[PDB]
Design a protein around this ligand. Sequence first.
Ligand SMILES: Nc1ncnc2c1ncn2[C@@H]1O[C@H](COP(=O)(O)OP(=O)(O)O)[C@@H](O)[C@H]1O
Ligand SMILES: [Zn+2]
Length: 263
Amino acid sequence: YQTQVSGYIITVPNETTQIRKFLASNQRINQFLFQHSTFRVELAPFAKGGERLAFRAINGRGDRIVLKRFFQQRPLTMLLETIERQLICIYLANIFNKLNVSPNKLHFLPNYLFIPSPTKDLDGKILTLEQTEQAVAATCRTPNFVEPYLSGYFIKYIDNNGWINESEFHSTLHAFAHWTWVHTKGALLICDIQGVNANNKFYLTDPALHHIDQNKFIYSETNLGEVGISQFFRTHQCNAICQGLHLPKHKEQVLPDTTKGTT
Ligand SMILES: Nc1ncnc2c1ncn2[C@@H]1O[C@H](COP(=O)(O)OP(=O)(O)O)[C@@H](O)[C@H]1O
Ligand SMILES: [Zn+2]
């Protein structure tokens, strides 16, 4: 069974700029674009995880998407952390890809929120965080996450604590993790790199993010601060992509360079 849901997709306008600003200064995103939207959603969820239920949907352009709804209410600012994290990863990955150090390209799945609405008057408008909370609360529902459907053989490549999948090693992913820390000047590290690999393309989902600032990604269970960053680097070996990029090493690195895998 499936029915129509109408409402608003909420994204961040000018994401590149806002992320670049969020990263350089210390100031949260305070700008959210609403776009009226209508999908067909299944009634029965086809999967659950620890925290939420997963429904198949079609978005109107005909794309296969997944709608995710949480088991019980979570406040907006928590859901927003997942979105802010995803937009950091996409922003980092786009830059990294553009370096053209590797024939493999990284794509984190887009995440946005959706809220059901009888009305379309916020369509095309940018709202503040407070205004977004009021539009969510007018609904009295926790918003859903929406992301493109991903099929294929799913693999966890690097966890958020120094573990490495050895038989599915790709040097592009390890150099990416290392580089995220270089590009953000030691502030953060992207790991929990996992998803699907097809035709030189990694479709990646649910990454973790370690931040040196305790006050920064406060809800994430997978953020392990400076300790997480150290854990990654203890087992990290700079590979031919790290070398090609001249990545300076974290001081916790002890192991010698390796030259297996890409390039
Ligand atoms: N394309 C997709 N995007 C998101 N989730 C998907 C997708 N395809 C399948 N799923 C299913 O969603 C399940 C649970 O979703 P997940 O996001 O992990 O929920 P939880 O956050 O509670 O762990 C996954 O194990 C998988 O079975
Ligand atoms: Zn390295």
